[PDB]
Amino acid sequence: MISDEQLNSLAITFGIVMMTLIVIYHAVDSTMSP
Amino acid sequence: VHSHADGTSYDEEPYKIKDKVIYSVGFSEWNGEEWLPHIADDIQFELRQVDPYYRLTLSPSGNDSETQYYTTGEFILPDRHGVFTFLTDYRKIGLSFTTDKDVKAIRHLANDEYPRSWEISNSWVYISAICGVIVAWIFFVVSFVTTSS
Amino acid sequence: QPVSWPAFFFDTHFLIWLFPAGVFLLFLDLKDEHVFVIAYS
Amino acid sequence: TYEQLYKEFHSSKSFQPFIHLDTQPKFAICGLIVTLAVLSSALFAVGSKSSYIKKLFFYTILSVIGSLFAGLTTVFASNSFGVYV
Amino acid sequence: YEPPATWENVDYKRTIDVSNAYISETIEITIKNIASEPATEYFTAFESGIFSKVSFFSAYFTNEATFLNSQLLAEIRYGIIQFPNAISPQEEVSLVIKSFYNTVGIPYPEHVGMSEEQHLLWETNRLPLSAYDTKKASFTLIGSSSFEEYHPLLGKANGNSFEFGPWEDIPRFSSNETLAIVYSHNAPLNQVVNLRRDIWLSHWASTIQFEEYYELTNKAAKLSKGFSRLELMKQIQTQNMRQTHFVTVLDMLLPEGATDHYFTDLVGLVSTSHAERDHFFIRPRFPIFGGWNYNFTVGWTNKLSDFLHVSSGSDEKFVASIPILNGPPDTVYDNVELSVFLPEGAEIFDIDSPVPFTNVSIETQKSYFDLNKGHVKLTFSYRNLISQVANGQVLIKYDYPKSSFFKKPLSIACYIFTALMGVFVLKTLNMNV
Amino acid sequence: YLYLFVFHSTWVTRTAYSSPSVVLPKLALIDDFREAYYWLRMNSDEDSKVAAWWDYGYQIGGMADRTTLVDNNTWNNTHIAIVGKAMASPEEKSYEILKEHDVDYVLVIFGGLIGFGGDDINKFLWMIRISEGIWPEEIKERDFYTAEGEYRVDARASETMRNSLLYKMSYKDFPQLFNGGQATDRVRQQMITPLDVPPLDYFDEVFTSENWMVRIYQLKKDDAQGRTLRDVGELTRSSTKTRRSIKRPELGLRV
Amino acid sequence: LNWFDDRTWYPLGRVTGGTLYPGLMTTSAFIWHALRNWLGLPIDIRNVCVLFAPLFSGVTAWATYEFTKEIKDASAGLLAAGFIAIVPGYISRSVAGSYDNEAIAITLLMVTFMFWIKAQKTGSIMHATCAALFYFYMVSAWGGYVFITNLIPLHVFLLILMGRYSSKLYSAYTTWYAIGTVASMQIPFVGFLPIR
Amino acid sequence: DKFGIKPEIHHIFHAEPKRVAKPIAVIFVLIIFITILSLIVTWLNSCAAAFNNIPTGVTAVYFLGFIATIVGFEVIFARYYLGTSIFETLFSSLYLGAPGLLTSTKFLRSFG
Ligand SMILES: *[C@@H]1O[C@H](CO)[C@@H](O[C@@H]2O[C@H](CO)[C@@H](O[C@@H]3O[C@H](CO[C@H]4O[C@H](CO)[C@@H](O)[C@H](O)[C@@H]4O)[C@@H](O)[C@H](O[C@H]4O[C@H](CO)[C@@H](O)[C@H](O)[C@@H]4O[C@H]4O[C@H](CO)[C@@H](O)[C@H](O)[C@@H]4O[C@H]4O[C@H](CO)[C@@H](O)[C@H](O)[C@@H]4O)[C@@H]3O)[C@H](O)[C@H]2NC(C)=O)[C@H](O)[C@H]1NC(C)=O
Ligand SMILES: CCCCC/C=C/C/C=C/CCCCCCCC(=O)O[C@H](COC(=O)CCCCCCCCCCCCCCC)COP(=O)([O-])OCC[N+](C)(C)C
Ligand SMILES: CCCCC/C=C/C/C=C\CCCCCCCC(=O)O[C@H](COC(=O)CCCCCCCCCCCCCCC)COP(=O)([O-])OCC[N+](C)(C)C
Ligand SMILES: CCCCC/C=C\C/C=C\CCCCCCCC(=O)O[C@H](COC(=O)CCCCCCCCCCCCCCC)COP(=O)([O-])OCC[N+](C)(C)C
Ligand SMILES: CCCCC/C=C\C/C=C\CCCCCCCC(=O)O[C@H](COC(=O)CCCCCCCCCCCCCCC)COP(=O)([O-])OCC[N+](C)(C)C
Ligand SMILES: *[C@@H]1O[C@H](CO)[C@@H](O[C@@H]2O[C@H](CO)[C@@H](O[C@@H]3O[C@H](CO)[C@@H](O)[C@H](O)[C@@H]3O)[C@H](O)[C@H]2NC(C)=O)[C@H](O)[C@H]1NC(C)=O
Ligand SMILES: *[C@@H]1O[C@H](CO)[C@@H](O[C@@H]2O[C@H](CO)[C@@H](O)[C@H](O)[C@H]2NC(C)=O)[C@H](O)[C@H]1NC(C)=O
Ligand SMILES: *[C@@H]1O[C@H](CO)[C@@H](O)[C@H](O)[C@H]1NC(C)=O
Ligand SMILES: [Mn+2]
């Protein structure tokens, strides 16, 4: 199966990707919409 | 053996509170060569949780070739649910001692087993009112759509 | 059983201080939903 | 008969898997992307505001491919995750 | 019943090896013919009790490895041996009749301490109880370090053997005498009351998954004065590699190249398991003492390439040889249910089992991603199987056309396509007011 | 700050809120609860009743699958009090109270061998306090403390603590574990000797886990000749020295 | 619903029917049955109960997004969903294996507050009815439903003191109350308490 | 006397709650019946709810469907009140609301 340090890396990667997509979305929406 | 008033065994229909039940046992006496019916008049059956809820003297009711059969009447189980014990303890000084105990579970009334609304003369009013309101709503929707302002 | 202060930081990081600030900003516009939010808070 | 079968069972031909299990993960991933691409286009087709006929003839033809890929992708992903089909 | 008395035994060498947890009996005979008719069959007499529990019955000529046809019938019972060359009115032919009985002797004191050695009491017949008049006969016990008759036609020990011979002629059906003997045993004496094997074959992943569920119990001498954890730890502390009659570790022997082992219980999994070199050591949660139960599960996976061969007649016709047992080295099974699960599209074509079964069934049972109809499930039932003696491979020929191979992704895609069409319908419908 | 929050969150959930409950993790795994519950499940009668503190009722009933007496959803305090008064009274009163409720086994938790800390002896005082509000004239909480006011499990302990049921049912055979009889508790940090623990005359020990964490005893059936189990015990135990003189037993009138 | 187990509180017994919130077990059984019949996956029931909280934490995330898209904007809803997805204060009680009332409840709380805010700021009767339905779904899952029944009135009450009464308020609140209060008395456990 | 005959014991049940005499509960049912009749007469004869503006074109085949939906739901509930299971009620509601929703949203769209 998958070990623990791998699931930790996976959780952290999911979180980072989520928070980066959220920041990009907010920037796009705030710059291109009054 | 114990069962419903009408013979329906326990496994067929588990017990509940205030359900008529009957209990029966048989006693035989050995006298050296063969068994015969044992005739006694002081035997007691007890239905108890931790304390005796029912204590009834068994009365002779039927016979046979080798045993004598005793039975309580058609007593009504109590109105308290729980895991009860039907026990017959025959301990007469001089004779052999005999214990027969069965641990059953007396259930509570299910949401289905309650006198319906039409069976209670006190609730004819409320059901009549519900029906009246539903029929007035049904006529109001129709008369609200059909007619124009 | 009251809780001490470190637990509030333990359970929410960087979001404990922003919570009062957001209640304030939500108390500057004061729309109808914001009253529900403030009461909850 | 048991002996006739036991002798039949010793035929030099042995089972050879269609797609090796070691390379089933990869396929899955690949399939996944396609399953996500084409399918998504179909969903966007709805709401085009074109004729009903065009939006149906396009939705069905895009789903008859999204499905066909998604079935294989599901089989491969199940096999790769340890739950064999 | 009484069979024809057309055979006169001139020798009867009956040996009984009590070494393991089952009785292994061997009868060497040099039968001769009396009645003047060419005959081709021979009867062997078993009692009622022991006949109820017989796990293996083989016969063969002493000259070579020719296994003569031998079948148990279907109030002493009989087994029948059939010859291929009917013997002449006067002929002498030697034979070896091997049998395995699930019975074993009962603990004699019944209650014995954690460290005392245990004795077993086993009672059988002494004089040869056969369906014919024998001229010579013997009897020998082997497999225990100490033999002792119970309430004594007496035996003279020879090392670890206990030979007593009623050599002189004996009238047939001599069943009056019973012989009870106590021997010493120092093995766990474990028995599986129920086994539920399950072999799942998969063509897509090309794998065969085995999963077994064992209801085990040690039927050795019970533990007197309850179970004391302190006494156990003390024994572990000093008694290094000392033979015992409780189960500490089991050694499952799996097929070559197994992978993804797992050992589970009915309360989660167990972490005391170790798989090395086609071997799997499993330690139960608690040491199974005499009279204790333990129900558990074992599982593993193998390559389907070395269990499924493709018929050269038609490219879409498969044969499978699947083992009957894979478990502890010296165990006894009172019930086996071997289920084989073939893919959603198979069609059984032929079936063969090396040992007789009690019931064979074919059904379907749905599993993960089985939409139309479940896997084909073929179940064999067995009654008295012994670990090392019940060797054999069930053979199953079946069909699996490419059109059934590709029907699984097609079914999944049909489900997804119907879902999409329904979403489209409900998304292109005006429900506004 | 957002990325730091992600990292902090992952760390906190991996370190503080991801610890199992049935297995207890130098740094080895302790699976005594599942071991004892499974023993109960497989080597006991299917209609047996288990009597234990109310904290474990849901696992004793969910993993062992046996009838219990008290659960975690304490809805009848008087039943939890009956069950607490039977783990604090002399062995005879405990036998009576338990048998009257048809109890079959008794399960105690002992963490004095590996420093568990949440064992039964630690929550004993609550068993005393809950069973004191209903029978204030039988179980007195000030009788388990020493003459000074200390809760001691040592030799200096009160005779009431020494004679209670939980004490002699948890510390049975513990002194004779370590050679010399100098067994040292690890939760209370006190030395126990073989004399501190009186024998059990009414209960048999049927199971003790590998780390002595869970102990399961069984009520023995009343004597056939109808005498007190304590007299049976004293007869088998102190047999080498008996009163060989004949003296009128000074009984009362036979009815 | 008419269960009576004799394997607990041995002599007395437990009726269970009137001392249990049948909202989590019902959802678990429904998901189990659906996976078993409509999807072809005969997943075990222990895996449907161990992975219940993780599966419903993304439903709590979407509920938070929808609730925050009504207060400010979609971007704030995305931010709030991202926050509540992994915040430890929720993970403590939503970890895999924690098969308790809270896992489901704290999702239904947000699903109910999103409909109460849609109804309170739109005046719709349909959204007030959805709010009442999910409120009933919550009284039957968690004993902390007493939060909603005391926080939705307060809101309205406050809006009355601030002089912000409007027909939308009347419509929303009277629909929510009328429906939810009569539907919350049908749960055997909570019966006749709302009036007394 | 510890061993010997013992006195009997019979449980004591409570008296079930009393139900009002029947002739006192039929009068109120009659009052409610007369009240509903009077309501229907008040609508029918106060110049309100007069049955005009009845659709008769193609939209009439939709108006009947609208009525069919409403009355059919009240029939399902009736059946349920009389003993029908809850799952059968859910399935009946599904089957009757699938086309009823369409027919009753089309009626409202056609009726301005
Ligand atoms: C939570 O758990 C706890 C612990 O498990 C539960 O607590 C137990 O509850 C029991 C009942 O709820 C209770 O049992 C009753 O105790 C009463 C108190 O008696 C005490 O005082 C007397 C002296 O007066 C002592 O002798 C006795 O030992 C006690 O110390 C008893 O009075 C009750 O006896 C009656 O019931 C039993 C069994 O039902 C009969 O055997 C007995 O003969 C009594 O029966 C009379 O009453 C019943 C109806 O109640 C009649 O059916 C019957 O025919 C008898 O009727 C006569 O008397 C009545 C007046 O009582 C009269 O009107 C009639 O005409 C007749 O003359 C009974 O023994 C336990 O003591 C109690 N235990 C503890 C430790 O607290 C608690 O219930 C649980 N809570 C739940 C489940 O919600
Ligand atoms: C929109 C959703 C899209 C998908 C997103 C989520 C999926 C990713 C999941 C990641 C890992 C999951 C697998 C866990 C690891 C093994 C679990 C296990 O081993 O447990 C299994 C349970 O198996 C499952 O049911 C898992 C299902 C497999 C998941 C594959 C993903 C595809 C899903 C797409 C669904 C499309 C539906 C189409 C409609 C028909 C228990 O096996 P067993 O005890 O029977 O032993 C088996 C041994 N015999 C057979 C011998 C007894
Ligand atoms: C509207 C939906 C449309 C799409 C439909 C698709 C739905 C999802 C389908 C498949 C996804 C996986 C479903 C559960 C499979 C893991 C079972 C398990 O628990 O496996 C656990 C392993 O833990 C895991 O890896 C957990 C990670 C994987 C699950 C998380 C991803 C999906 C979560 C959302 C779905 C949850 C649905 C059930 C709960 C409500 C082992 O189980 P075991 O102890 O029996 O060992 C079985 C193997 N031995 C016996 C051989 C040892
Ligand atoms: C709404 C959408 C939500 C999306 C997110 C939801 C869930 C994901 C979050 C967390 C997942 C937890 C991961 C647990 C994994 C434990 C099992 C494990 O460890 O598997 C790993 C293997 O992995 C893999 O290489 C799998 C690679 C395949 C990539 C995934 C394919 C896409 C599936 C998703 C879409 C499915 C349907 C598509 C069309 C509808 C170990 O396998 P093994 O050695 O145990 O057995 C296998 C035995 N052999 C090795 C012999 C085979
Ligand atoms: C546009 C048309 C809309 C139609 C209305 C639609 C929905 C109504 C909205 C709310 C209804 C509130 C009243 C609840 C009554 C339930 C019926 C019932 O629980 O069954 C009851 C069982 O009694 C009970 O214990 C009620 C206890 C309530 C427990 C319910 C568990 C909570 C579940 C929460 C949601 C779970 C969803 C899972 C999947 C997401 C009767 O069942 P029976 O088979 O015995 O029949 C009996 C026929 N007698 C009545 C005439 C005899
Ligand atoms: C683990 O496997 C053992 C081995 O089969 C199971 O033992 C069996 O348990 C059942 C019920 O617990 C016994 O049935 C009983 O039969 C007696 C007649 O002897 C009857 O009077 C009882 O009312 C009951 O029906 C069965 O005899 C017993 N088998 C043996 C060989 O002892 C055990 O149940 C399994 N445990 C689990 C948790 O799966
Ligand atoms: C052989 O097949 C099965 C073995 O389980 C048995 O027959 C069926 O047994 C099931 C009970 O598991 C019944 O529900 C079925 O009605 C039985 N018959 C069929 C046709 O399925 C039985 O042991 C054997 N059946 C025989 C000899 O006919
Ligand atoms: C029942 O009747 C009497 C009992 O006094 C006696 O004949 C015998 O016990 C029984 N007779 C029959 C025919 O059952
Ligand atoms: Mn809880």
Author numbering:
A (entry chain B): 1 to 34
B (entry chain G): 270 to 418
C (entry chain A): 352 to 392
D (entry chain C): 2 to 86
E (entry chain E): 25 to 98, 111 to 188, 194 to 474
F (entry chain A): 458 to 482, 489 to 718
G (entry chain A): 67 to 262
H (entry chain F): 173 to 284
What's the paper's own text on this?
Oligosaccharyltransferase (OST) is the central enzyme of N-linked protein glycosylation. It catalyzes the transfer of a pre-assembled glycan, GlcNAc2Man9Glc3, from a dolichyl-pyrophosphate donor to acceptor sites in secretory proteins in the lumen of the endoplasmic reticulum. In higher metazoans and fungi, OST is a multimeric complex composed of eight subunits spatially arranged in three subcomplexes that are formed during OST assembly. Subcomplex I contains OST1 and OST5; subcomplex II contains OST3 (or OST6), STT3, and OST4; and subcomplex III contains OST2, WBP1, and SWP1.
We identified two distinct functional states of OST in this sample: A binary complex containing bound LLO (resolved at 3.0 Å resolution) and a ternary complex containing both donor and acceptor substrates (resolved at 3.1 Å resolution). In the structure containing Dol20-PP-GlcNAc2Man9Glc3, we observed well-defined EM density covering the catalytically important divalent ion Mn2+, the four isoprenyl units of Dol20, the pyrophosphate group, and the entire A-branch glycan, which includes two GlcNAc units at the reducing end, four mannose units, and the three terminal glucoses. The Dol20 lipid reaches approximately halfway across the membrane and is accommodated in a hydrophobic groove formed by TM6 and TM11 of the catalytic subunit STT3. The pyrophosphate group is coordinated by the manganese (II) ion and the STT3 residues Trp208 and Arg404. The A-branch of the glycan revealed a stretched or extended conformation, oriented parallel to the membrane plane, and is in contact with OST residues over its entire length. While all the nine hexose units of the A-branch were well defined in the EM density, we identified two regions where the glycan was specifically recognized: (1) the GlcNAc2 group at the reducing-end and (2) the terminal Glc3 moiety at the non-reducing end. Close to the active site, Tyr521 and Asn536 form hydrogen bonds with the N-acetyl group of the first GlcNAc, while Thr537 interacts with the second GlcNAc unit. At the non-reducing end, the terminal Glc3 are accommodated in a binding pocket formed by the auxiliary subunits OST2 and WBP1. Specifically, the terminal α,1-2 glucose interacts with Tyr383 of the WBP1 subunit via CH-π stacking, whereas the penultimate glucose interacts via hydrogen bonding with Asn75 of the OST2 subunit. Binding of LLO to an apo-state of OST leads to the formation of an “LLO-primed” state, where EL5 and TM9 remain unengaged and allowing access of a glycosylation sequon to the active site.
